Symmetry: D5
Subunit: 162 residues, 10 copies
Amino acid sequence: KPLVGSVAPDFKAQAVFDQEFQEITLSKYRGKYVVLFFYPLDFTFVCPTEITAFSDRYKEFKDINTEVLGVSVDSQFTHLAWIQTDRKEGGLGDLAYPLVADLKKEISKAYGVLTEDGISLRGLFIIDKEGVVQHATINNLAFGRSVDETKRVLQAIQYVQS
Amino acid sequence: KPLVGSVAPDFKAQAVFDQEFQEITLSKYRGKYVVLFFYPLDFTFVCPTEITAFSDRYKEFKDINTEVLGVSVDSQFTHLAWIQTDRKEGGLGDLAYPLVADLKKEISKAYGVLTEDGISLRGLFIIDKEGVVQHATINNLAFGRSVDETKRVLQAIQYVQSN
Amino acid sequence: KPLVGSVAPDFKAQAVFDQEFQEITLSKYRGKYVVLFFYPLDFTFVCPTEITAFSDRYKEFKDINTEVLGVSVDSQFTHLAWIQTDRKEGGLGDLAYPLVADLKKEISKAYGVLTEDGISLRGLFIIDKEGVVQHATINNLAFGRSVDETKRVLQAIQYVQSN
Amino acid sequence: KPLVGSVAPDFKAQAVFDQEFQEITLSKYRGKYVVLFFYPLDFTFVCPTEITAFSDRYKEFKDINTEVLGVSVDSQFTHLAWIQTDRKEGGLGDLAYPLVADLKKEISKAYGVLTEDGISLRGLFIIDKEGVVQHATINNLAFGRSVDETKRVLQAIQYVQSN
Amino acid sequence: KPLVGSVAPDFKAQAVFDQEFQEITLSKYRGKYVVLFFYPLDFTFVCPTEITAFSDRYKEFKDINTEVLGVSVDSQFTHLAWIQTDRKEGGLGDLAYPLVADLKKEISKAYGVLTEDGISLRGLFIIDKEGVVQHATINNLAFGRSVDETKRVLQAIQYVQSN
Amino acid sequence: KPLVGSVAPDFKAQAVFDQEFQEITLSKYRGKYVVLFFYPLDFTFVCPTEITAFSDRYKEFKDINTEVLGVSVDSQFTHLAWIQTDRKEGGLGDLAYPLVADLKKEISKAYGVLTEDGISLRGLFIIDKEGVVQHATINNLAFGRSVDETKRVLQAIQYVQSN
Amino acid sequence: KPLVGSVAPDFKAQAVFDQEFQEITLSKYRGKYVVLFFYPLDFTFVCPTEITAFSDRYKEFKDINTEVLGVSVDSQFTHLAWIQTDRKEGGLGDLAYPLVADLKKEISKAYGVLTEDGISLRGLFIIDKEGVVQHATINNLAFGRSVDETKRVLQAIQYVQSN
Amino acid sequence: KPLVGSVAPDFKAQAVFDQEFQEITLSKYRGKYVVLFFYPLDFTFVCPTEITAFSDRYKEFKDINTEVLGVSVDSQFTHLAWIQTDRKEGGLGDLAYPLVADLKKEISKAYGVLTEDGISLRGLFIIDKEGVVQHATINNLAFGRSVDETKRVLQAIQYVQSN
Amino acid sequence: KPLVGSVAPDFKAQAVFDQEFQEITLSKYRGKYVVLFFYPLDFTFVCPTEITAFSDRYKEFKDINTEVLGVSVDSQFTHLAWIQTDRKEGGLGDLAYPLVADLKKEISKAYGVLTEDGISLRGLFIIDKEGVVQHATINNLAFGRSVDETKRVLQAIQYVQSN
Amino acid sequence: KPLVGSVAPDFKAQAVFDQEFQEITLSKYRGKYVVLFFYPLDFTFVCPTEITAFSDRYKEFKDINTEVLGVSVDSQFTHLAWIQTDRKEGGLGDLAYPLVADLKKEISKAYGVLTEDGISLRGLFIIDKEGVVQHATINNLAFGRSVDETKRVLQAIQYVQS
């Protein structure tokens, strides 16, 4: 019954990568660890430090066979405009990993983070090479996601599986 | 059964007038005519002629007791960011009328224009002073909708409701 | 769920063409664009401009690979008596395209335009060569249908479906 | 269970009488006998003697406290055009009794005469002063209705109910 | 849905013919017309002319390839005692055609003539050579049925079905 | 669950008594014993001694405060014709007690004696002063019922219910 | 529906015969008539003449190809103790036919004689050589069963089935 | 769900005490401990030690505020015949406590010990003063019930329910 | 229905023999007798006499072809920690037999000894060589169960299954 | 639908505190923050550092109006024996906060951490003064719970609510 310990619900969605549109399938990433995270909405007045921190430190995750995937319920087109908007004027700047458009709210619903208001909560899941969910962190409010702690829990999971 | 002829499904939703957020309610427009239109998505590579041409001629609609309302399934923050982008680099510029945020997709649903993809088709309904839908234009593809033609239909409707 | 952007409901019905009874199947028009319109009742005191305008201008539509079909819930025999009544004495005159009998109301119901009175609303549907609805105009009340506006929307649908 | 022996299903409908539209309620004929008959369609090539024979002899029913109501699934507007067409050219000529429009097909259905084709069978029904159905004659095919035999049954119901 | 126009419900029941008990199957009359009639009860005080008139004129039906069957909800034994009572003392006298016993009331029910009192109305059905019901007359009271009118209707149906 | 031991299902039905039609209600015999019996049909070739033996000895039952009722599924009219046929010619002759018509077959059904052929078995029920069933005999064929044994059983029940 | 006229419900049960336990199957008596009777309880203060009269006269049934089976809801062990008690002290004495234990109450229930108290009513049933129930007598109360009248019915069923 | 530790199902039943019939209600024993035991059948060839041992030693149980009730599915009349049979001739003799008739099997079913054979298993239940089951011993087969062991478990239940 | 007499519900669960973990399966004991007992909880202030006295005399059970199995709803790690605690400070010391861990509570459920509190009552079942439950002792409260008495019942059972 | 953001399912259960048995009701703690955590089972061979770390540092949570509650599905009696077993021999040693007995598995089921094997997963929830769940961390495997990070997320929630 619990999402942690079970096989990660698969998905096919539009994403922006290297400022172009492509189709992403979660199970195409098997053989690799995935850090899948949800944030409510693009173009808010909340500083997007939860997305940009992972972009600036993306190299540390590639170098340990981890991909990173960000998800909100905004369209591929909203993601792309937010990525081409500078950090200084409320944007994201270039982004090193895919930003997923959950336009039908099926990914947020499947992972248990969709609220009645039509947006996901703040939430992170670490998925193993065989596609099993080994960790979930879910936040009702905007405070720090520590990138140091995300990486610690992820190295703790790699250690225990080898 | 049919939407045209029936009383307009009501909705309470967030919107953007004058670069501020406000809750708007359809029924709080009874005694004005409403041009309610839907479009797929903010920030597309489709030129937003449909939205901007209504803005640029809004004067004419104010002047025959009519409100204009656009809707998509995008958030209210997305609407503000598209309004605050200049037309020259893919935006709307200042919008003379509320742009409604169907974020839950419930307005599109109740008007029969939500698709399997999670976005609305291009559709325009005309709602009269009493709230009853008198007209619907629904388009699958992008092609310059005639504001001249929309306005003709609004006047023919206005003409027949005073005779 | 939306009619527009889905495959047009097929139908097999009696119609009047060149003053004779004929079986019409919508899907036999695949390869051609179809302007399919609905009006309420034959032999009313409303001028039938929305039907004679398409007759006089039929050539403009045939020259861009387009059939026209009008539909009411009246019988085929009612249609033929209305076609053989002159425009002078309240009728249609000679008509250049088929007029369809929706006598069971199955067509009006499946296109979303059957009222609880047992008649269709005033409605227009453009259907492409592969049998998909691209456009829908539905009116509660009688005014002009602009044949200019129909031709515009049709030709914009034709231009978009090459490029 | 059987229609004959039970209280005639009431209807409110449009009718043509003295070339004008009016609302008929079957229950406002209590106090009078009603001959209620159904025929399939207006403007066919079947000679309408089932309607015209009753009209031509209508004084004979009026003078024995009897109304005649004819019914088909055509509109008020088709009924008027048929009444205003001369017998010589396939019309009815002036009609002496109301012609009822069963546009929704609810009267045909309640009287068990609606076919899968959306038209009624030929049927006649005699309804008494208290609105009970005393007689039904139902025909799959077209041949002469004897007005003399209809009147024989009518007067036999009158004679039995006098005693 | 209407009985008239559809295949006659078949039955296998006891009958009295030529003062003897036999089993009658309706479908074994395929190739002949059938006048099937229903009356309420044997041994009432209503003079039975609706039965005996057909007996006395049976040869006229037999000469146009038509069988006559009478049905009530009484037993074959009640039928035989009634047939063997003289007309002076209340009975039928010899009967030239089968009198069918609908003891389980199934035939009355299937033809739509069974009342809540457990008896049939007075009812008459003309069934063609293929077993389709072409005509029904149904009376709530003893008004008198005309053998001449039955015979005229039957010959009209035979005339129509050869042309 | 067993009928014997429980309150007799009440009935209101037509009967023939003293050559006249009257309505019989079982519960109106409260205060008296009832021999209720059922036989299949009137006017059969089985000699009716099961009915006439009780007629000829009725005074014996009346003198011990007991009514006799006979029931079949035949009409009151069939009952009266049978009562008015002499015993030599197949009938009952005068009958001293009511012969009840179970025309809707409800009484046969409630007492558990209705067969699939739409007739009752031969059955006899003794019902006491409070309306409770104390005895049943039920025969599949005409074996002969003994009035002496019926009478012995009745007096045994009367003897037991006073001590 | 009725038990009488239908194939006797089969049972497999323990019985006492010649003071020993054995399994009885009702269907192994095909070829023979069976008188099957039910009584409430063993060891009551009601004189058991309903059981002992049949035993004392058992040769008379055996010599007309008839078995006698008595049934109650008591156990095989209670039946044996009752058979081994002298008549003088409330027993049966030696019994000439099997006494069947309806310990689960399934036989009482299948024969419609089980009361809400968990015992059977007094009932007798005659079953023929093919295992059809031809006769049933059911009693709410205790009085003399005439063995002569049981034998009269038995032999009447034998005589009717010989012909 | 468990019987043990829940309130004992109440029951109202016929029993035999001091050779007379008495109505026993389990809940009238509130204020006293109850040893309630079940055995299969009276008058078997098994020695009834599990019942005579409790009789001889009844005083030991009454002196610690404890009633005893034995239960079988046999009738009260069966019980009395078994009590009035000497131990020498296969019986109980004089019995110091009530023996209960579970004739409808309702008691055996509600204590969980009714087999599909229609008899109870060998079972024992100790019930405290407030009507709660504290103990259950259930055996498939016949051996000793140790009255020493019952008395032990009872007195340990009594000692625990002070302290 | 009842557990005693029926085949023992099987279970696959973790256990503790010789201070190691092993999966045990009831049915892999067929051809030995099993004493299966349940107790509420590990590490209570109740002296574990029931568990230790069976250990201390296990020799006697090994010697008459019998296994012992204790069960509670506690984890297998809890069982090891209670076994590895000396009797003097609240523990079991070395246990001569498997101690089963009903962690999912499914064994207790299937044996009818799970309470609303989530723990088993004190219960003992004896299962024979073929797997059929022949005995059940169920206790609500804590009182020294007699190992002498349990063993007597196991031998009586053993005695009867060789005769 | 999501447990984070919603009102915390209330419970009444047996617990051990100061080595005695008492009844705990979660809603008796309203007016205070609660850190409610689940661990699989008592008396395992896994070092219980996830329980003892919070016991040793309990004072830091009392001093910021937080109570701590540990839950497994073992009985009140199993908890007490584990608490009176020394750390050196696989026990817990004295314990500064209640250890809850979820004997019927109703608390584990309500919080979404009960597996099919009859035990909770490793999981932590921070509940606000008004009884709303503002955080969830759920782990499929035994690695570090950081007490430093638990306290950071908890101080982040206090900050944002005042």
